[PDB]
């Protein structure tokens, strides 16, 4: 437990299942979990899976690292000190 | 010597005297504290401050690398700055200054905030007034080992022959030592607990 | 319920309101007359994102039995972090 | 450190005895007092555990 | 510009901030991006140029707010026989604005507090709002306030909520507000009510047999207790009731002892 | 003369390593016991075995043998910390607690012939025969002076090319206050240490064919000042140093070399 994740969008900070993660996304963007997709880069993440399967290396001081429904299904760098 | 000065001139520190002054005497004046930018006077070799109301040295006194003679006897100093260890004096006089005796441990805690961590770490890699204030509050580069943040402050005891080859015995019963501000990351805190 | 924190680079970091409200200046920027979102012309993207990362443990464990694990900091970044933290009161 | 490990494992007891401690400084302070009351052998156990 | 020191117009930053203080005063809505840019402007002022301009920011803030308080004083002076009524909501809105001021000037507060103008600017705004009670509106306010509070066994029930609002405004501001509240309002009010009840107790003693006097004085003490509960703040109840009992009793103790 | 600055970071690292070595409690307790006996016998020199130091920390042992002075002051400061931890009353009786070395030193085992300039600043173990002793004479290390006019005491501590110190030091004996008042020495409150010079000669049977035996001068201080007499076959462990001299604005680069001993062992009985 206590997995915190960054979700690229710039990113959402989130913290449990992928379904709960989609509920966190709904908590601001308001679209239901059925109208969302989540990935590990190119690899899709299914709703029922725990975020540990996507593993407690995403510790909250350094959390690790999104698409929406078009009509019926979901589809479609930082700076340095000078 | 023997005037009525309430304080040394603050803006005078960054004047021509910054590069030129080699002897300064402010003894027998009711100065209670020198300004923190007094450390700009890095040309200084001789400094005399005795018989004053002086309750602290400036914390950045360690930048006075030219300093060889220091006299601050019968002042109000409770303990020495942490950067006093960086001095390499020839002569040191601190007689009758009423330093504190106890080995108590009233340590200031960090809480590990990002601001304290930044002020600690940026001193090792450093005009901006915030940066200058952070330099003044560097806490000796966030303590000499296991650095976390520039606020973990306490006090230990120092032998004055570490910094001067001639020392006036500050008090009796041996009396060759005085307290000094310290920083207590890990083993330092362990040693402080052992001392207390 | 949520808060969006915009860096000067345009990168936008979207956090829970308690996480944003941990810091003094940001909870002030989230408090204005007559009325969420804050933007910072001061802070670059990397520093603001890492400040959000610091928030994510500061909310998770404060007055916790567990430790605070080491935040991601470097001395080269620490100057920018000093200025940013002095602005933000994080 | 061994002291920090002890404090992490005993912060709940400190807070249960003193619910008015809002600041981590006073919690560390009370923890230092209790950790001083511990015996030499117990403090060795914590030093080896660390 | 980024967070490092660079050339930024102090007058422009102060002017945009000034037009934002014009919203903070009386609680007009301000757009969020502009509100954040005011923090950015304060940072550009107060970091280094090469000294921090926080003193300029604080002094100009004090001057602008004092111009507003002078206008508020003029409008209150214009509001004949309604000065406390307008002043209640004026101080409420301006104190909420002071809260938003303490929010807005946060960077200046942390920069300057190590030297303490420039520290708790909302507290500065309130302490300077008390300059309205330094002006001659102090007498105009307290006279009508204590009069309508002194409505009693006759004319009754003024706007007690508004009156308590003014009393709270007096018992808020100090930089120990009870001393200021007493020197402005409570000493005159307490002494005048004590004089009134001295006259009333004298009249009751003149008119009444002992039983009549007894029920009359205790009933009127209960009346003033209810009056305290209704019109006044909780710090004044005991003092008023004690001043009233020190004239219904202990001023005429010989009659009781007989 | 004699004052040298050391890098505090490596000094603290070395002192940490040596204090870890000396705090032998969890292991067999060898050096816990030896420091207890040092306290009990009223001694202030601990003889450490570099074999044990190699078993516990090999790199620190190698750096000790190759960088003798800085490593030895680190070790002696660690020893003072440890003896203070055991008995804080006893730790203040002596200005400094010394460490001598025994065991096997690898290639640093030498004779006066093979002891060349390559070994300067190294710990060396020289085996030979004693051919000369000087008379034991006191050497001032710390003098206390009482100013009768000002009614205050100054205390000064000294050094020379022989005595490298790693703390600030003088080499001039004072005679006047900063107010130009005379100063009276407090001999009883001053600290002096015994000093003697000996000469160790190569064993004659080991000399090459046509050669006469060679010699090395050795400086013994403190308890070692009368541990060897002429005719003794000895092993001296110490630091090999040169003494840069000068003569009236000029120096001949020829510097005499001495072995500042830290341990002396007989080879008989």
Which of the other chains make 3 or more beta carbon contacts under 8 angstroms with chain D? B, C
Q: Do E29 and C34 touch (CB under 8 A)?
A: yes
Written as one string, the DSSP assignment of chain C is: -EEEEE-TTS-EEEEEHHHHHTSHHHHHHT--TT--EEE-SSS-HHHHHHHHHHHHHHHH-SS-SS--PPP---HHHHHHHHHHHHHH--
Give the best residue of E39, E48, E96, E102 to mutate against chain C (max C CB count within 10 A). Answer: E39
- d(C-alpha F35, C-alpha B57), whole Å: 40
| Residue F238 CB neighbours (<10 A) | 25
Tell me the chain D residues in contact with residue B187 when contact means C-beta distances shorter than 8 Å. Answer: 1
| C51, C76, C79 member nearest B114 (Cβ) | C51
- d(C-alpha A77, C-alpha F231), whole Å: 81
What is the separation of C-alpha E222 from the centre of its chain, rounded to a whole number of angstroms? 28
Residue with tokens 């000078």: A82
The answer to whether E170 and E177 are in contact (CB under 8 A) is: yes
Which of the other chains make 3 or more beta carbon contacts under 8 angstroms with chain F? B
- Tokens standing for residue F72: 């030895």
Tell me the chain F residues in contact with residue B163 when contact means C-beta distances shorter than 8 Å. Answer: 168
The answer to whether B82 and B63 are in contact (CB under 8 A) is: no
User: What architecture (CATH level 2) is domain C1-90?
Assistant: 2-Layer Sandwich (3.30)
Q: Taking an 8 Å Cβ-Cβ cutoff, which residues of chain B contact chain E?
A: 127-130
Which among F139, E105, C44 has a CA at the least distance from the CA of A81?
C44
Tell me the chain E residues in contact with residue C28 when contact means C-beta distances shorter than 8 Å. Answer: 39, 103-104, 106
The answer to whether F197 and F218 are in contact (CB under 8 A) is: yes
C-alpha distances in angstroms, F39 versus F17, F44, F95, F96? 22, 7, 14, 13
The burial class, CB within 10 Å (0-12 / 13-18 / 19+), for F246 is: exposed
* E201 to chain C, closest Cα gap in Å: 52
- Hey, is B137 helix, strand or coil? coil
* D21 near B CB under 8 A: no
The answer to whether B17 and B8 are in contact (CB under 8 A) is: no
- Tokens standing for residue C10: 């345009």
Experimental method of this PDB entry = cryo-EM
Tell me the chain C residues in contact with residue B138 when contact means C-beta distances shorter than 8 Å. Answer: none
- Tokens standing for residue B147: 């650095």
Written as one string, the DSSP assignment of chain F is: -------HHHHHHHHHHHHHHH--TTTT-HHHHHHHHHHHTT--EEEEEHHHHHHH-HHHHHHHHHSHHHHHHHHHHHHHHHHHHH-HHHHTSSS--EEEEES--GGGEE-TTT--GGGTTSEEEEEEEEEEEPPPEEEEEEEEEEETTTTEEEEEEB--SS---SS--B-S---B-TTS-B-EEEEEEEEEEEEEEEEEE--GGGS-TTPPPPEEEEEEEGGGGGS--TT-EEEEEEEEEEE---SSS---S--EEEEEEEEEEE---
- d(C-alpha F111, C-alpha F104), whole Å: 15
Tell me the chain B residues in contact with residue E51 when contact means C-beta distances shorter than 8 Å. Answer: 129
* D33 to chain B, closest Cα gap in Å: 10
The answer to whether E217 and E204 are in contact (CB under 8 A) is: yes
| E50, E52, E111 member nearest B127 (Cβ) | E50
- d(C-alpha B168, C-alpha F252), whole Å: 39
Residue of B nearest to E4 (CA): B128
Give the DSSP letter of residue B40: G
- d(C-alpha E65, C-alpha E125), whole Å: 7
Size of interface B-E (CB pairs under 8 A): 15
* D1 to chain B, closest Cα gap in Å: 6
Tell me the chain E residues in contact with residue C41 when contact means C-beta distances shorter than 8 Å. Answer: 1-2, 37, 40
- d(C-alpha B45, C-alpha B22), whole Å: 5
* C90 to chain A, closest Cα gap in Å: 14
Q: SS3 letters for chain E? A: CCCCCCCCCHHHHHHHHHHHHHHHCCCCCCCHHHHHHHHHHHHHHHCCCCCCCHHHHHHHHHHHHHHHHHHHHHHHHHCCCCHHHHHHHHHHHHHHHHHHHHHHCHHHHHHHCCCCCCCCHHHHHHHHHHHHCCCCHHHHHHHHHHHHHCCCCCCCCCCHHHHHHHHHHHCCCCCCHHHHHHHHHHHHHHHHHHHHHHHHHHHHHHHCCHHHHHHHHHHHHHHHHHHHHHHCCCCCHHHHHHHHHHHHCCCCHHHHHC
Q: Is the peptide bond before D37 cis (omega within 30 degrees of 0)?
A: no
| B95, B162, B166 member nearest F156 (Cβ) | B166
Q: Do C75 and B115 touch (CB under 8 A)?
A: no
What is the separation of C-alpha E255 from the centre of its chain, rounded to a whole number of angstroms? 43
| Residue F10 CB neighbours (<10 A) | 14
| Residue F172 CB neighbours (<10 A) | 8
Residue of E nearest to B132 (CA): E48
| Residue F153 CB neighbours (<10 A) | 19
- d(C-alpha A25, C-alpha A33), whole Å: 8
| C68, C79, C85 member nearest B126 (Cβ) | C79
Size of interface B-C (CB pairs under 8 A): 55
Chain breaks after residues in chain B, where C lies over 2.5 Å from next N: 126
* C35 near D CB under 8 A: no
* E103 near C CB under 8 A: yes
Tell me the chain B residues in contact with residue D24 when contact means C-beta distances shorter than 8 Å. Answer: 109, 111
Tell me the chain F residues in contact with residue B72 when contact means C-beta distances shorter than 8 Å. Answer: none
Element (H, E) at B18: helix B17-20
Angle between helices E237-248 and E210-231 (to 10 degrees): 160
Which among B57, B45, B49 has a CA at the least distance from the CA of B73?
B49
Q: What angle do CA E109, E114, E118 make, to 5 degrees?
A: 35
* D43 to chain B, closest Cα gap in Å: 12
Q: Determine the topology of domain A1-82 in CATH.
A: Ubiquitin-like (UB roll) (3.10.20)
Q: Going by C-beta distance under 8 Å and a sequence separation of 6 or more, which residues neighbour residue E9?
A: none
Q: Do B114 and C90 touch (CB under 8 A)?
A: yes
- Give residue limits of the domains in chain C: 1-90
Q: Do C36 and E32 touch (CB under 8 A)?
A: yes
* B95 near F CB under 8 A: yes
| B109, B190, B193 member nearest D24 (Cβ) | B109
- d(C-alpha D19, C-alpha E106), whole Å: 31
| Number of residues written out for chain D | 50
- Give residue limits of the domains in chain A: 1-82
Residue of C nearest to D10 (CA): C65
Element (H, E) at D14: helix D2-17
Q: Going by C-beta distance under 8 Å and a sequence separation of 6 or more, which residues neighbour residue E88?
A: E162, E165, E166, E169
What is the separation of C-alpha B190 from the centre of its chain, rounded to a whole number of angstroms? 23
- Resolution of the determined structure in angstroms stands at 2.8
Residue of D nearest to C63 (CA): D24
- d(C-alpha C33, C-alpha C24), whole Å: 17
* F111 near B CB under 8 A: no
* B16 near D CB under 8 A: no
Which among B37, B34, B30 has a CA at the least distance from the CA of B47?
B34
Residue with tokens 């593993």: A55
* B63 to chain C, closest Cα gap in Å: 21
- d(C-alpha F201, C-alpha F196), whole Å: 17
Give the best residue of C58, C61, C64, C65 to mutate against chain D (max D CB count within 10 A). Answer: C65
C-alpha distances in angstroms, F115 versus E199, F109, F230? 117, 9, 21
The answer to whether F115 and F125 are in contact (CB under 8 A) is: no
Q: Taking an 8 Å Cβ-Cβ cutoff, which residues of chain B contact chain C?
A: 112-115, 117-122, 124-126, 128, 130-131, 134
| Residue B110 CB neighbours (<10 A) | 22
Tell me the chain B residues in contact with residue E52 when contact means C-beta distances shorter than 8 Å. Answer: 129
- d(C-alpha F109, C-alpha F103), whole Å: 10
Q: Do F155 and B91 touch (CB under 8 A)?
A: no
C-alpha distances in angstroms, D24 versus C24, D19, E153, F49? 19, 12, 58, 47
Angle between helices D24-37 and D2-17 (to 10 degrees): 110
* B132 to chain C, closest Cα gap in Å: 11
* E40 to chain B, closest Cα gap in Å: 16
Residue of A nearest to C3 (CA): A28
Bridge-based pairing of strands F256-266 and F137-147 is: unpaired
* D24 to chain C, closest Cα gap in Å: 7
Which among E137, D40, C7, F131 has a CA at the least distance from the CA of A78?
C7
Give the best residue of E50, E53, E108, E115 to mutate against chain B (max B CB count within 10 A). Answer: E50
* B15 near F CB under 8 A: no
| F9, F144, F167 member nearest B162 (Cβ) | F167
Q: What are phi and psi of E234, to 5 degrees?
A: -65, -20
What is the separation of C-alpha E242 from the centre of its chain, rounded to a whole number of angstroms? 25
């Amino acid at each position: 437990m206590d997995v915190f994740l960054m979700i690229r969008r710039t990113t959402i900070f989130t913290d449990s299942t992928v379904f709960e993660l989609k509920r966190i996304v709904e908590g601001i963007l308001k679209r239901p979990p059925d109208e969302q997709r989540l990935y590990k880069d190119d690899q899709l993440l299914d709703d029922g899976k725990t975020l540990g399967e996507c593993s407690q290396t995403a510790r909250p001081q350094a959390p690790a690292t999104l698409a929406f429904r078009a009509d019926d299904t979901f589809e479609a760098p930082f700076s340095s000190p000078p | 010597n023997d005037n009525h000065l309430e304080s040394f001139s603050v803006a005078l520190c960054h004047s021509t005297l910054q590069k030129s002054l080699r002897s300064l005497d402010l003894s027998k004046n009711k100065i209670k504290a020198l300004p923190v930018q007094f450390c700009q006077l890095q040309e200084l070799k001789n400094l005399k401050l005795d018989d004053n109301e002086l309750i602290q040295f400036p914390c950045k006194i360690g930048q006075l690398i030219n300093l060889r003679f220091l006299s601050a006897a019968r002042n109000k100093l409770p303990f020495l700055p942490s950067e006093f260890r960086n001095l390499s004096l020839e002569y040191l006089d601190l007689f009758g200054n009423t330093f504190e005796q106890p080995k108590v441990l009233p340590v200031i805690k960090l809480q590990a905030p990002l601001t304290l961590l930044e002020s600690s770490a940026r001193t090792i890699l450093h005009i901006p007034f915030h940066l200058c204030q952070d330099l003044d509050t560097a806490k000796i580069c966030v303590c000499g080992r296991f650095c976390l943040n520039s606020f973990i402050q306490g006090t230990t005891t120092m032998n004055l022959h570490s910094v001067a080859h001639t020392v006036v015995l500050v008090d009796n019963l041996g009396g060759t030592e005085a307290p000094i501000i310290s920083y207590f990351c890990s083993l330092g805190c362990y040693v402080n607990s052992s001392d207390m | 319920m949520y808060v969006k924190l915009i860096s000067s680079d345009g990168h936008e970091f979207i956090v829970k309101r308690e996480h944003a409200l941990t810091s003094g200046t940001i909870k002030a920027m989230l408090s204005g007359p007559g009325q969420n979102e804050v933007n910072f012309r001061e802070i670059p993207s990397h520093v603001l994102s890492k400040v959000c990362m610091y928030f994510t443990y500061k909310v998770r464990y404060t007055n916790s039995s567990t430790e605070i694990p080491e935040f991601p900091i470097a001395p080269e970044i620490a100057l920018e972090l000093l200025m940013a933290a002095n602005f933000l009161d994080c | 450190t061994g002291f920090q490990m002890w404090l992490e494992e005993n912060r709940s007891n400190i807070l249960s005895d003193n619910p008015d401690f809002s600041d981590e400084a006073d919690i560390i302070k009370e923890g230092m007092i209790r950790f001083r009351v511990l015996s030499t052998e117990e403090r060795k156990v914590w030093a080896n555990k660390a | 510009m980024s967070l490092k020191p660079r050339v930024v117009d102090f007058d422009e930053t102060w002017n945009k901030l000034l037009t934002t203080i014009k919203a903070v005063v009386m609680l007009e809505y301000v757009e969020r991006a502009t509100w954040n840019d005011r923090f950015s402007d304060i940072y550009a002022l107060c970091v280094a140029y090469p000294e921090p301009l926080g003193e300029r920011l604080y002094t100009e803030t004090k001057i602008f707010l004092e111009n507003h308080v002078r206008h508020l004083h003029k409008r209150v002076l214009e509001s004949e026989e309604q000065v406390l009524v307008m002043y209640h909501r004026y101080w409420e809105e301006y104190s909420k604005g002071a809260d938003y001021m303490d929010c807005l000037y946060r960077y200046l507060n942390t920069q300057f507090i190590k030297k303490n103008p420039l520290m708790e600017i909302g507290e500065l705004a309130l302490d300077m709002w008390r300059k309205l009670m330094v002006e001659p509106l102090q007498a105009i306010l307290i006279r009508m306030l204590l009069r309508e509070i002194k409505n009693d066994r006759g004319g009754e029930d003024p706007n007690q909520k508004v009156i308590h609002g003014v009393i709270n405004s007096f018992v808020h501001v100090e930089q120990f507000p009870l001393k200021f509240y007493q020197e402005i309002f409570e000493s005159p009010f307490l002494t005048e009510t004590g004089e009134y009840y001295k006259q009333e107790a004298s009249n009751l003693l003149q008119e009444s047999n002992c039983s009549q006097y007894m029920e009359k004085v205790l009933g009127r003490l209960k009346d003033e207790e209810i009056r305290c509960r209704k019109y006044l703040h909780p710090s004044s109840y005991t003092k008023v009731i004690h001043e009233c009992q020190q004239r219904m009793v202990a001023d005429h103790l010989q009659f009781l002892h007989a | 003369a004699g004052t040298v600055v050391l890098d505090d970071v490596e000094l603290r690292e070395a002192q940490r390593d040596y204090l870890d070595f000396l705090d032998d409690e969890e292991d067999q307790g060898i050096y816990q016991s030896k420091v207890r006996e040092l306290i009990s016998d009223n001694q202030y020199r601990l003889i450490v075995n570099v074999n044990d130091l190699r078993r516990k920390n090999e790199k620190r042992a190698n750096r000790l043998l190759n960088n003798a002075f800085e490593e030895l002051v680190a070790f002696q400061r660690a020893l003072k910390d440890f003896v203070a931890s055991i008995d804080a009353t006893y730790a203040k009786q002596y200005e400094e607690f010394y460490v001598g070395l025994e065991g096997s030193f690898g290639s640093k085992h030498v004779s006066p012939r093979t002891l060349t300039s390559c070994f300067l600043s190294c710990v060396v173990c020289v085996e030979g025969i004693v051919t000369k002793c000087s008379l034991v004479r006191p050497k001032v290390v710390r003098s206390v002076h009482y100013c009768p006019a000002t009614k205050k005491t100054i205390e000064r501590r000294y050094s020379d090319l022989t005595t490298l110190v790693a703390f600030p030091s003088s080499s001039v004996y004072p005679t006047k206050d900063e107010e130009n008042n005379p100063l009276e020495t407090e001999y009883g409150l001053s600290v002096y240490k015994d000093h003697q010079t000996i000469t160790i000669q190569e064993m004659p049977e080991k000399a090459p064919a046509g050669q006469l035996p060679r010699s090395v001068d050795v400086i013994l201080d403190d308890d070692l000042v009368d541990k060897a007499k002429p005719g003794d076959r000895v092993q001296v462990v110490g630091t090999y140093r040169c003494l840069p001299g000068k003569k009236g604005g000029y120096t001949s680069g020829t510097f005499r070399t001495v072995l500042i001993a830290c341990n002396v062992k007989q080879m008989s009985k």
